[PDB]
Design a protein around this ligand. Structure first.
Ligand SMILES: Nc1ncnc2c1ncn2[C@@H]1O[C@H](COP(=O)(O)OP(=O)(O)O)[C@@H](O)[C@H]1O
Ligand SMILES: Nc1ncnc2c1ncn2[C@@H]1O[C@H](COP(=O)(O)OP(=O)(O)O)[C@@H](O)[C@H]1O
Lengths: 721, 321, 205
């Protein structure tokens, strides 16, 4: 009784754990009460208990520092025993750990321990290990003497002492600066996938030992460099306790034939001797490149040696093999045969939210000025991966360091803690570093959840509903679809006049679902056609599956038909190399993949009709030009983020701009904005957009869709219904 | 549950709360007729959205005569006005408020009908001082329904070191098959939750299930002398009632002190925030410390602060076991 | 049964890999007895522009390999080749010569009794109310193909699902669902195309 399963915490603070409120109510303890946690090897830790809205009833959420003090790991169980008898401390003696205090000197109490404990009233027990961050260093301390025993609450009147040599770390304790799960920012879905596939066979092998089904044997991670492929594998090994054996291409390929295979198989033998263990092979494409590209003895023999070593995993119990490559098709396909590397995970490129979290991880030890805005940085760093954000934080720190160290002039082996304590990194130092940094993943397609929501689309209320029903009804009422033998549609084609929201509709449904949006534009379809590289379509569909839940949006389906003449035409017809691959892959998509395929075109009369055959883009939605009330909604949405004067009559403008699409009403809004900007600048050499600027803007904008085009679009819609 | 009527000090049960407060508000007219009518408007009427609309419309009538006291057309509020009839006349206590702040209820000939109509006409006594209605308007606008005070049932406890002395069997750390099945299923479900395509409405149906558990809170205060002080509050009670609660228990109710929240965040007595807004609901432990103005004299004199609470409460200390 | 679809014929043509035709026929030889079905024989002709396209003839790299393999295949292997096209006017006439697909069968739109049979067969997967008059519907859907009768069945089913879901915010497909479907379903072959198909069949006598 009173025992909970140890899980991850959200609050990084080292003196608190979080329980689900019903367990605090059964234990009759209040938020903020001090409790003891009973761990392994007759150890205990003292902490404050709070609660949150994410902890399960049977779980206790604690960070890495608390788990290390209890010598427990994620998945273990501890007992909770409230200790209201804890008294206030009179004198506490704290000394640093030598492993983290090297190269730094000065008064550690004034910089670290004092602000850490001051007015914090943290519970302290003799032998506790805790981390204090600051001055671009992470320093941990051990408590060696407490006047009250064995635990107390620190108070502003408690005497804090610190004299003596730094303490040498015990060999059974891991450093708090090691890689763990809290060092991974984005790609939480991929990390969860690894947890399921890896923790089970390493922690509970009995589920496979007594039965004829084998565990997963190998996981192939792929994506651009600097995305966390080695970070995830290392974090998992450290958190679970499995021995991490690091292998990489160059280390093996630099060796001579015979030696290279000996080193490879030796690592596998050591993994068993020290099992549980994870064998991680980085740059797998260097170990096992495509055979037709090489004839060397090392490149060919190392593949045969790796293939048989992977098969040996049947006997190498508690050992799993992971590898990293750039793309799933950059390695010898033999490694992906039954068994061996049976699972794969696409790490991808962190999105704006993930990039912010990555920056927050790197700045853990950094003192930031009040002007620093890491969210603004994360939004600007498009195309960057974690390796680039790590360099960004380092460069910003180095700029701040140079500015102050030129005045500090500390010439010695160690640096004072005080001078580091006052060193802050400003927004100008991040902006400077941003101008010097260069993204390593700018060429690859970036896929993320779009920010376009339903409030950004004027009109089309019936279309908004249909897109929501196509996701809610097939999953809430599967019995009714089966009852009548109907298969839910897995795609829709949008057609009609341009500038009415075709793209926004596909993004808005992805936004509300928190699904990834993959945007394929005309130039991309044309690049594959022109370069005779239509095989790349298979990669697009494969990315959509890995990105699930996602919306796979194929825009400008007529881009190739128009490139071939559109209204005139070259020596071909409606079908081409690229659409043929799309048609072939489309037939392989299932409603269970959580991928919704959306197409769009402004000329549906010139696209391969095969795409509309049953089983593909079965839904057909016509997007007409907006009516009067929709045009007003469009104007209001376009001006949602701008100051607008009260004299601006948006209904009056909408009444006149009868032929204007949403794209054309935006031009009017942006023209009025630009006019207001000129007025403000010239006045300095007014703070809101006045009617005069909208009235002039309307004199320059024109309708993009003519009356002839409206009839063409309506006739097509009526033809298909 | 026991409650105290804040207007009389009477001891009430949960069912007697409205009956006694309503009567106490009607009695309060002998001390402050305006304050009694203000309490009557918010307390007797259960529909608080209609109470606010009636109060805003009354505030407008008072501003009209306040801004233009020289024009007699703003001295009379017509009880048959299409706005008055829906917003003000539908509430109990609004008629008494007009009389309390210097209006007389009279029947005046209509501008186009033989039948006299009902008006509240401001008298010369209050019209001569427009600042009187301005203050009465502010008193009504800042008002809220009167609720019986929850009996705090203050208790003092002494933690017993014996509660922390317990040895576990070694097998208590061996994860069971039932715990393993749930952990393995949760690993698969967590990946399925992130992998599945779902709209925000389908997500809300499950997420919203955790939002409605509590309406009361229990607070404990850790005193520097090792004693624990406990009492009960509304989930929406103000921080000032916790400071008053502690002041009542202290041997010296005037002696300045500070309270800290469950995370160490200092709470100031002058910050009139609700306990559910302070993060002290459904339960929390607060830390007690004497103000620096008090600690400086105790330390400078070499005194031992060996007494915090009244002897009348300390004689009733229970052990925590 | 070996099924070759348009996308495979187009892949071989576009990628200049018509040699793969030999592997297709080799499968038929090893799979015998078998039926070797080449669907969408006009898939390449349409990919070449169909009615306009280039200035050349109907011959192409893939059909040439297919015709060669056909001539080299004996009836002693118990392999029978079937072709299908919805645009016979744009396929290589060589495939119709003696020794190839010299037997021609015209498949018109289903007649009155056949359309009823199609509706009944397509509805075997769903509950249908006793008030549904499938013969009346078939009489109206005079210009509908079997695929278009499926669209009606699917629309009536989806309409039954829509109403059933709404009732919880029905147990079977009612006449109203089929009559409503009749207002959304359309024939895929226009009256001009129906006459073209009949006139082509008449031209071949
Ligand atoms: N997803 C991520 N989350 C957090 N940090 C990341 C992530 N991806 C990369 N990094 C950071 O970038 C660097 C990656 O370098 P390295 O350790 O060689 O890993 P890899 O090259 O496999 O990505 C590390 O400093 C790591 O902390
Ligand atoms: N229905 C609409 N509501 C609001 N804005 C619209 C709408 N349709 C078009 N716009 C405006 O037109 C711009 C382009 O829209 P987009 O969806 O990219 O057009 P398309 O899909 O035809 O390329 C958007 O920035 C948006 O401001």
């Amino acid at each position: 009784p009173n025992r909970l399963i140890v899980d991850e915490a959200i609050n990084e603070d080292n003196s608190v754990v979080s329980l689900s409120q019903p367990k605090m109510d059964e234990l009759q303890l209040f938020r903020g009460d001090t409790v003891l946690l009973k761990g392994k090897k007759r150890r205990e830790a003292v902490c404050i208990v709070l609660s949150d809205d994410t902890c399960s009833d049977e779980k206790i959420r604690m960070n890495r520092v608390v788990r290390n003090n209890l010598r427990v790991r994620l998945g273990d169980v501890i007992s909770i025993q409230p200790c209201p008898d804890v008294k206030y401390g009179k004198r506490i003696h704290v000394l640093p750990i030598d492993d983290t205090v090297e190269g730094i000197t000065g008064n550690l109490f004034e910089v670290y321990l004092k602000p850490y404990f001051l007015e914090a009233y943290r519970p302290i027990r003799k032998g506790d290990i805790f981390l204090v961050r600051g001055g671009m260093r992470a320093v941990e301390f051990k408590v060696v003497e407490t006047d009250p025993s064995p635990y107390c609450i620190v108070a502003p009147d408690t005497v804090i002492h610190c004299e003596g040599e730094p303490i040498k770390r015990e060999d059974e304790e891991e450093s708090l600066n090691e890689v763990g799960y809290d060092d991974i920012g984005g790609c939480r879905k991929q990390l969860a996938q690894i947890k399921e596939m890896v923790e089970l066979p390493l922690r509970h092998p009995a589920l496979f030992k007594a039965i004829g089904v084998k565990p997963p044997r190998g996981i192939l991670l792929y994506g651009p460099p600097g995305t966390g492929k080695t970070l995830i594998a290392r974090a998992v090994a450290n958190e679970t306790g499995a021995f991490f054996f690091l292998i990489n291409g160059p280390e093996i390929m630099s060796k001579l034939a015979g030696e290279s295979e000996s080193n490879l198989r030796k690592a596998f033998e050591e993994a068993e001797k020290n099992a549980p263990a994870i064998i991680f092979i980085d740059e797998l494409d260097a170990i096992a490149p495509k055979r037709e590209k090489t004839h060397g003895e090392v490149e060919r023999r190392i593949v045969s040696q790796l293939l048989t070593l992977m098969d040996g995993l049947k006997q190498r119990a508690h050992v799993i093999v992971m590898a990293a490559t750039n793309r799933p098709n950059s390695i010898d396909p033999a490694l992906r045969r039954f068994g061996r590397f049976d699972r794969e995970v696409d790490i991808g490129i962190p999105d704006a939210t993930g990039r912010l979290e990555i920056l927050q991880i790197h700045t853990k030890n950094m003192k930031l000025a009040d002007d620093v805005d890491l969210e603004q940085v994360a939004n600007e760093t498009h195309g960057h991966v974690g390796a680039d954000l790590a360099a960004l934080c380092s460069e910003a720190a180095l700029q701040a360091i140079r500015k102050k160290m030129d005045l500090i002039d500390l010439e010695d082996e160690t640096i004072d803690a005080e001078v580091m304590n006052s060193l802050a990194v400003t927004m100008d130092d991040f902006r400077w570093a941003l101008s010097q940094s260069n993204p390593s993943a700018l060429r690859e397609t970036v896929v993320e959840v779009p920010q376009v929501t339903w409030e950004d689309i004027g009109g089309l209320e019936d279309v908004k509903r249909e897109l929501q029903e196509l996701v809610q009804y097939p999953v809430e009422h599967p019995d009714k679809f089966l009852k009548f033998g109907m298969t839910p549609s897995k795609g829709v084609l949008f057609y009609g006049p341009p500038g009415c929201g075709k793209t926004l509709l596909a993004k808005a449904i992805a936004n509300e679902c928190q699904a990834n949006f993959i945007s394929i534009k005309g130039p991309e379809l044309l690049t594959m056609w022109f370069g005779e590289s239509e095989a790349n379509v298979r990669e697009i569909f494969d990315k959509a599956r890995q990105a699930a839940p996602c919306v796979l949006f194929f825009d400008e389906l007529d881009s190739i038909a128009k490139a071939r003449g559109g209204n005139i035409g070259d020596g071909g017809g409606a079908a081409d190399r690229v659409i043929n691959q799309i048609l072939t892959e489309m037939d392989g998509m299932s409603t269970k993949k959580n991928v919704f395929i959306i197409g769009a075109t402004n000329r549906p009369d010139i696209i391969d009709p095969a795409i509309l055959r049953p089983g593909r883009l079965d839904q057909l939605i016509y997007i007409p030009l907006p009516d009067e009330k929709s045009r007003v909604a469009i104007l209001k949405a376009n001006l949602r983020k701008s100051p607008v004067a009260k004299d601006v009559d948006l209904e009056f403008l909408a009444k006149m701009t009868n032929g204007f699409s949403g794209a054309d009403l935006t031009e009017i809004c942006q023209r009025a904005c630009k006019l207001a900007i000129r007025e403000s600048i010239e006045s300095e050499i007014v703070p809101e957009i006045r009617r005069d600027h909208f009235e002039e803007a309307m004199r320059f904008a024109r309708r993009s869709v003519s009356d002839n085009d409206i009839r063409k679009y309506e006739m097509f819609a009526q033809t298909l219904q | 549950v026991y409650f105290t009527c804040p207007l009389t000090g009477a001891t009430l049960r949960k069912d007697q709360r409205d009956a006694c407060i309503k009567e106490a508000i009607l009695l309060h007219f002998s001390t402050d007729p305006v304050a009694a009518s203000i309490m009557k408007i918010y307390t007797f009427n259960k529909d608080q959205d209609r109470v606010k609309l009636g109060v805003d419309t009354i505030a407008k009538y008072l501003d009209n005569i306040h801004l233009h006291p020289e024009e007699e057309k703003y001295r009379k509020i017509k009880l048959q006005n299409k706005v008055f009839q829906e917003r003000i006349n539908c509430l109990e206590g609004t008629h008494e408020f007009f009389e309390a702040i210097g209006f007389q209820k009279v029947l005046l000939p209509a501008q186009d009908q033989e039948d006299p109509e009902e008006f509240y006409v401001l008298s010369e006594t209050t019209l001569a001082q427009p600042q009187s209605l301005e203050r009465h308007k502010e008193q009504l606008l800042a008002a809220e329904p009167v609720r019986a005070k929850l009996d705090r049932q203050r208790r003092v406890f002494q933690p017993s070191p014996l509660a922390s002395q317990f040895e576990l069997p070694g097998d208590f750390f061996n994860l069971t098959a039932e715990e393993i099945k749930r952990e393995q299923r949760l690993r698969s479900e967590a990946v399925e939750r992130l992998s599945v395509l779902r709209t925000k409405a389908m997500r809300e149906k499950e997420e919203q299930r955790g939002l409605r558990k509590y309406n009361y809170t229990l607070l404990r205060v850790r005193l520097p002398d090792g004693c624990l002080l406990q009492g009960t509050f509304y989930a929406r009670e103000r921080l000032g009632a916790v400071y008053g609660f502690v002041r009542e228990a202290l041997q010296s109710d005037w002696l300045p002190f500070e309270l800290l929240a469950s995370g160490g965040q200092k709470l100031s007595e002058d910050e009139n925030l609700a306990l559910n807004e302070c993060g002290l609901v459904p339960s929390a432990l607060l830390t007690f410390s004497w103000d620096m103005a008090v600690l400086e004299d105790i330390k400078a004199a070499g005194a031992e602060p060996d007494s915090i609470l009244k002897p009348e409460l300390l004689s009733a200390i229970e052990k925590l076991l």
